[PDB]
PDB file of all heavy atoms in Angstrom:
ATOM      1  N   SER E  37       8.358 135.333 -53.071  1.00 53.17           N
ATOM      2  CA  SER E  37       9.495 136.232 -53.239  1.00 53.17           C
ATOM      3  C   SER E  37      10.701 135.764 -52.437  1.00 53.17           C
ATOM      4  O   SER E  37      11.839 135.851 -52.908  1.00 53.17           O
ATOM      5  CB  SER E  37       9.103 137.652 -52.841  1.00 53.17           C
ATOM      6  OG  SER E  37       9.994 138.597 -53.407  1.00 53.17           O
ATOM      7  N   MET E  38      10.475 135.252 -51.231  1.00 56.12           N
ATOM      8  CA  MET E  38      11.561 134.777 -50.389  1.00 56.12           C
ATOM      9  C   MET E  38      11.949 133.332 -50.674  1.00 56.12           C
ATOM     10  O   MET E  38      12.682 132.737 -49.881  1.00 56.12           O
ATOM     11  CB  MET E  38      11.198 134.938 -48.909  1.00 56.12           C
ATOM     12  N   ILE E  39      11.489 132.756 -51.784  1.00 57.19           N
ATOM     13  CA  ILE E  39      11.884 131.394 -52.131  1.00 57.19           C
ATOM     14  C   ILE E  39      12.595 131.395 -53.476  1.00 57.19           C
ATOM     15  O   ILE E  39      13.778 131.044 -53.565  1.00 57.19           O
ATOM     16  CB  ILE E  39      10.673 130.447 -52.147  1.00 57.19           C
ATOM     17  CG1 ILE E  39      10.130 130.261 -50.731  1.00 57.19           C
ATOM     18  CG2 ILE E  39      11.059 129.107 -52.741  1.00 57.19           C
ATOM     19  CD1 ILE E  39       9.105 129.160 -50.612  1.00 57.19           C
ATOM     20  N   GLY E  41      13.672 133.812 -55.077  1.00 55.35           N
ATOM     21  CA  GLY E  41      14.791 134.724 -55.014  1.00 55.35           C
ATOM     22  C   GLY E  41      15.974 134.236 -54.215  1.00 55.35           C
ATOM     23  O   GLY E  41      16.941 134.982 -54.040  1.00 55.35           O
ATOM     24  N   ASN E  42      15.929 133.001 -53.720  1.00 56.93           N
ATOM     25  CA  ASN E  42      17.032 132.429 -52.960  1.00 56.93           C
ATOM     26  C   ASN E  42      17.628 131.202 -53.625  1.00 56.93           C
ATOM     27  O   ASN E  42      18.857 131.098 -53.726  1.00 56.93           O
ATOM     28  CB  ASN E  42      16.568 132.077 -51.541  1.00 56.93           C
ATOM     29  CG  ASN E  42      16.954 133.130 -50.537  1.00 56.93           C
ATOM     30  OD1 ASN E  42      18.083 133.614 -50.536  1.00 56.93           O
ATOM     31  ND2 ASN E  42      16.018 133.493 -49.671  1.00 56.93           N
ATOM     32  N   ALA E  56      21.577 140.687 -57.138  1.00 68.90           N
ATOM     33  CA  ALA E  56      20.213 140.889 -57.613  1.00 68.90           C
ATOM     34  C   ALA E  56      19.273 139.845 -57.023  1.00 68.90           C
ATOM     35  O   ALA E  56      18.218 140.183 -56.474  1.00 68.90           O
ATOM     36  CB  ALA E  56      20.179 140.843 -59.140  1.00 68.90           C
ATOM     37  N   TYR E  57      19.645 138.568 -57.130  1.00 71.97           N
ATOM     38  CA  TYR E  57      18.844 137.498 -56.541  1.00 71.97           C
ATOM     39  C   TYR E  57      18.666 137.689 -55.039  1.00 71.97           C
ATOM     40  O   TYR E  57      17.543 137.825 -54.545  1.00 71.97           O
ATOM     41  CB  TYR E  57      19.482 136.140 -56.833  1.00 71.97           C
ATOM     42  CG  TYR E  57      19.197 135.609 -58.215  1.00 71.97           C
ATOM     43  CD1 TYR E  57      20.016 134.649 -58.788  1.00 71.97           C
ATOM     44  CD2 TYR E  57      18.115 136.069 -58.947  1.00 71.97           C
ATOM     45  CE1 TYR E  57      19.768 134.162 -60.049  1.00 71.97           C
ATOM     46  CE2 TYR E  57      17.854 135.575 -60.205  1.00 71.97           C
ATOM     47  CZ  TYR E  57      18.688 134.628 -60.754  1.00 71.97           C
ATOM     48  OH  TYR E  57      18.432 134.141 -62.013  1.00 71.97           O
ATOM     49  N   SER E  58      19.768 137.699 -54.291  1.00 72.39           N
ATOM     50  CA  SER E  58      19.670 137.661 -52.836  1.00 72.39           C
ATOM     51  C   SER E  58      19.141 138.974 -52.272  1.00 72.39           C
ATOM     52  O   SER E  58      18.062 139.017 -51.671  1.00 72.39           O
ATOM     53  CB  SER E  58      21.038 137.332 -52.241  1.00 72.39           C
ATOM     54  OG  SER E  58      20.996 137.336 -50.825  1.00 72.39           O
ATOM     55  N   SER E  59      19.884 140.062 -52.468  1.00 72.18           N
ATOM     56  CA  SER E  59      19.589 141.311 -51.777  1.00 72.18           C
ATOM     57  C   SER E  59      18.314 141.984 -52.262  1.00 72.18           C
ATOM     58  O   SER E  59      17.847 142.921 -51.606  1.00 72.18           O
ATOM     59  CB  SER E  59      20.770 142.273 -51.917  1.00 72.18           C
ATOM     60  OG  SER E  59      21.307 142.241 -53.228  1.00 72.18           O
ATOM     61  N   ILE E  60      17.744 141.548 -53.383  1.00 73.71           N
ATOM     62  CA  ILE E  60      16.523 142.160 -53.892  1.00 73.71           C
ATOM     63  C   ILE E  60      15.442 141.109 -54.086  1.00 73.71           C
ATOM     64  O   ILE E  60      14.339 141.236 -53.542  1.00 73.71           O
ATOM     65  CB  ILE E  60      16.774 142.916 -55.209  1.00 73.71           C
ATOM     66  CG1 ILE E  60      17.856 143.981 -55.040  1.00 73.71           C
ATOM     67  CG2 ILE E  60      15.488 143.534 -55.718  1.00 73.71           C
ATOM     68  CD1 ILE E  60      19.256 143.499 -55.320  1.00 73.71           C
ATOM     69  N   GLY E  61      15.744 140.081 -54.883  1.00 72.72           N
ATOM     70  CA  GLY E  61      14.762 139.040 -55.142  1.00 72.72           C
ATOM     71  C   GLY E  61      14.169 138.463 -53.872  1.00 72.72           C
ATOM     72  O   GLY E  61      12.972 138.179 -53.807  1.00 72.72           O
ATOM     73  N   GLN E  62      14.997 138.297 -52.841  1.00 73.28           N
ATOM     74  CA  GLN E  62      14.501 137.849 -51.545  1.00 73.28           C
ATOM     75  C   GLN E  62      14.173 139.026 -50.633  1.00 73.28           C
ATOM     76  O   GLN E  62      13.007 139.240 -50.295  1.00 73.28           O
ATOM     77  CB  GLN E  62      15.529 136.936 -50.864  1.00 73.28           C
ATOM     78  CG  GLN E  62      15.195 136.618 -49.408  1.00 73.28           C
ATOM     79  CD  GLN E  62      16.431 136.409 -48.548  1.00 73.28           C
ATOM     80  OE1 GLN E  62      17.339 135.668 -48.916  1.00 73.28           O
ATOM     81  NE2 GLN E  62      16.468 137.063 -47.392  1.00 73.28           N
ATOM     82  N   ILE E  63      15.178 139.846 -50.309  1.00 78.94           N
ATOM     83  CA  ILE E  63      15.078 140.798 -49.204  1.00 78.94           C
ATOM     84  C   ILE E  63      13.875 141.725 -49.340  1.00 78.94           C
ATOM     85  O   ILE E  63      13.437 142.321 -48.350  1.00 78.94           O
ATOM     86  CB  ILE E  63      16.407 141.574 -49.077  1.00 78.94           C
ATOM     87  CG1 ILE E  63      17.541 140.596 -48.780  1.00 78.94           C
ATOM     88  CG2 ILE E  63      16.354 142.614 -47.971  1.00 78.94           C
ATOM     89  CD1 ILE E  63      18.811 141.259 -48.326  1.00 78.94           C
ATOM     90  N   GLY E  64      13.281 141.812 -50.526  1.00 77.24           N
ATOM     91  CA  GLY E  64      12.003 142.480 -50.653  1.00 77.24           C
ATOM     92  C   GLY E  64      10.861 141.606 -50.171  1.00 77.24           C
ATOM     93  O   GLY E  64       9.722 141.755 -50.622  1.00 77.24           O
ATOM     94  N   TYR E  65      11.157 140.683 -49.253  1.00 80.17           N
ATOM     95  CA  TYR E  65      10.157 139.792 -48.674  1.00 80.17           C
ATOM     96  C   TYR E  65       9.693 140.266 -47.303  1.00 80.17           C
ATOM     97  O   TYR E  65       8.500 140.479 -47.080  1.00 80.17           O
ATOM     98  CB  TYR E  65      10.703 138.357 -48.576  1.00 80.17           C
ATOM     99  N   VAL E  66      10.625 140.451 -46.371  1.00 81.03           N
ATOM    100  CA  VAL E  66      10.224 140.651 -44.990  1.00 81.03           C
ATOM    101  C   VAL E  66       9.810 142.096 -44.747  1.00 81.03           C
ATOM    102  O   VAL E  66       9.126 142.382 -43.757  1.00 81.03           O
ATOM    103  CB  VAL E  66      11.361 140.183 -44.064  1.00 81.03           C
ATOM    104  CG1 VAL E  66      12.594 141.067 -44.220  1.00 81.03           C
ATOM    105  CG2 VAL E  66      10.887 140.040 -42.622  1.00 81.03           C
ATOM    106  N   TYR E  85      13.681 148.414 -40.672  1.00 98.39           N
ATOM    107  CA  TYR E  85      14.323 147.461 -41.566  1.00 98.39           C
ATOM    108  C   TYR E  85      14.811 148.134 -42.838  1.00 98.39           C
ATOM    109  O   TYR E  85      15.861 147.766 -43.369  1.00 98.39           O
ATOM    110  CB  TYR E  85      13.387 146.312 -41.914  1.00 98.39           C
ATOM    111  CG  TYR E  85      14.117 145.231 -42.672  1.00 98.39           C
ATOM    112  CD1 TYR E  85      15.157 144.534 -42.079  1.00 98.39           C
ATOM    113  CD2 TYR E  85      13.800 144.939 -43.988  1.00 98.39           C
ATOM    114  CE1 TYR E  85      15.843 143.558 -42.764  1.00 98.39           C
ATOM    115  CE2 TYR E  85      14.483 143.964 -44.683  1.00 98.39           C
ATOM    116  CZ  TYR E  85      15.503 143.276 -44.066  1.00 98.39           C
ATOM    117  OH  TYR E  85      16.190 142.302 -44.750  1.00 98.39           O
ATOM    118  N   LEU E 136      23.971 141.036 -43.971  1.00 81.33           N
ATOM    119  CA  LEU E 136      22.905 140.587 -44.860  1.00 81.33           C
ATOM    120  C   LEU E 136      22.426 139.194 -44.476  1.00 81.33           C
ATOM    121  O   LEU E 136      21.230 138.892 -44.568  1.00 81.33           O
ATOM    122  CB  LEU E 136      23.386 140.606 -46.310  1.00 81.33           C
ATOM    123  CG  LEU E 136      23.228 141.922 -47.073  1.00 81.33           C
ATOM    124  CD1 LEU E 136      23.471 141.713 -48.558  1.00 81.33           C
ATOM    125  CD2 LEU E 136      21.851 142.508 -46.833  1.00 81.33           C
ATOM    126  N   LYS E 148      15.477 141.606 -38.989  1.00 70.11           N
ATOM    127  CA  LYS E 148      14.594 140.459 -39.183  1.00 70.11           C
ATOM    128  C   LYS E 148      13.858 140.104 -37.898  1.00 70.11           C
ATOM    129  O   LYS E 148      12.688 139.700 -37.931  1.00 70.11           O
ATOM    130  CB  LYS E 148      15.397 139.259 -39.680  1.00 70.11           C
ATOM    131  CG  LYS E 148      15.892 139.376 -41.108  1.00 70.11           C
ATOM    132  CD  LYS E 148      16.679 138.140 -41.503  1.00 70.11           C
ATOM    133  CE  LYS E 148      17.272 138.275 -42.894  1.00 70.11           C
ATOM    134  NZ  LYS E 148      18.015 137.051 -43.299  1.00 70.11           N
ATOM    135  N   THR E 170      14.102 130.488 -45.046  1.00 67.00           N
ATOM    136  CA  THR E 170      14.815 131.001 -46.207  1.00 67.00           C
ATOM    137  C   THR E 170      15.997 131.867 -45.797  1.00 67.00           C
ATOM    138  O   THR E 170      16.953 131.991 -46.562  1.00 67.00           O
ATOM    139  CB  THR E 170      13.881 131.786 -47.128  1.00 67.00           C
ATOM    140  N   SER E 171      15.973 132.452 -44.597  1.00 65.65           N
ATOM    141  CA  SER E 171      17.168 133.137 -44.109  1.00 65.65           C
ATOM    142  C   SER E 171      18.293 132.143 -43.843  1.00 65.65           C
ATOM    143  O   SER E 171      19.447 132.370 -44.242  1.00 65.65           O
ATOM    144  CB  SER E 171      16.843 133.933 -42.848  1.00 65.65           C
ATOM    145  OG  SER E 171      16.995 133.133 -41.689  1.00 65.65           O
ATOM    146  N   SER E 174      19.639 131.280 -47.054  1.00 67.48           N
ATOM    147  CA  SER E 174      20.432 132.361 -47.622  1.00 67.48           C
ATOM    148  C   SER E 174      21.822 132.434 -47.018  1.00 67.48           C
ATOM    149  O   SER E 174      22.737 132.958 -47.663  1.00 67.48           O
ATOM    150  CB  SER E 174      19.720 133.696 -47.418  1.00 67.48           C
ATOM    151  OG  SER E 174      19.670 134.030 -46.043  1.00 67.48           O
ATOM    152  N   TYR E 177      25.242 131.053 -49.551  1.00 70.54           N
ATOM    153  CA  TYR E 177      26.121 131.714 -50.513  1.00 70.54           C
ATOM    154  C   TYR E 177      26.943 132.820 -49.866  1.00 70.54           C
ATOM    155  O   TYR E 177      28.079 133.081 -50.292  1.00 70.54           O
ATOM    156  CB  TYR E 177      25.313 132.260 -51.690  1.00 70.54           C
ATOM    157  CG  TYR E 177      23.996 132.903 -51.318  1.00 70.54           C
ATOM    158  CD1 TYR E 177      23.955 134.164 -50.745  1.00 70.54           C
ATOM    159  CD2 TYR E 177      22.794 132.257 -51.566  1.00 70.54           C
ATOM    160  CE1 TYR E 177      22.754 134.756 -50.412  1.00 70.54           C
ATOM    161  CE2 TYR E 177      21.588 132.842 -51.237  1.00 70.54           C
ATOM    162  CZ  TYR E 177      21.575 134.092 -50.662  1.00 70.54           C
ATOM    163  OH  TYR E 177      20.375 134.677 -50.334  1.00 70.54           O
ATOM    164  N   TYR E 178      26.391 133.484 -48.849  1.00 73.95           N
ATOM    165  CA  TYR E 178      27.183 134.415 -48.058  1.00 73.95           C
ATOM    166  C   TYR E 178      28.422 133.725 -47.501  1.00 73.95           C
ATOM    167  O   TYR E 178      29.552 134.186 -47.700  1.00 73.95           O
ATOM    168  CB  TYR E 178      26.336 135.001 -46.929  1.00 73.95           C
ATOM    169  CG  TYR E 178      25.179 135.839 -47.410  1.00 73.95           C
ATOM    170  CD1 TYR E 178      23.931 135.737 -46.815  1.00 73.95           C
ATOM    171  CD2 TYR E 178      25.336 136.737 -48.453  1.00 73.95           C
ATOM    172  CE1 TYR E 178      22.870 136.502 -47.250  1.00 73.95           C
ATOM    173  CE2 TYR E 178      24.280 137.508 -48.895  1.00 73.95           C
ATOM    174  CZ  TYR E 178      23.051 137.386 -48.290  1.00 73.95           C
ATOM    175  OH  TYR E 178      21.997 138.151 -48.728  1.00 73.95           O
TER     176      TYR E 178
END
Side-chain angles (χ1 to χ4, degrees), chain E residues 37 39 41-42 56-64 66 85 136 148 171 174 177-178:
Chain E
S37 200
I39 292 190
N42 261 315
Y57 280 159
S58 178
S59 41
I60 303 90
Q62 170 211 311
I63 299 193
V66 66
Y85 188 63
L136 273 192
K148 289 180 184 181
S171 88
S174 67
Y177 41 75
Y178 296 138

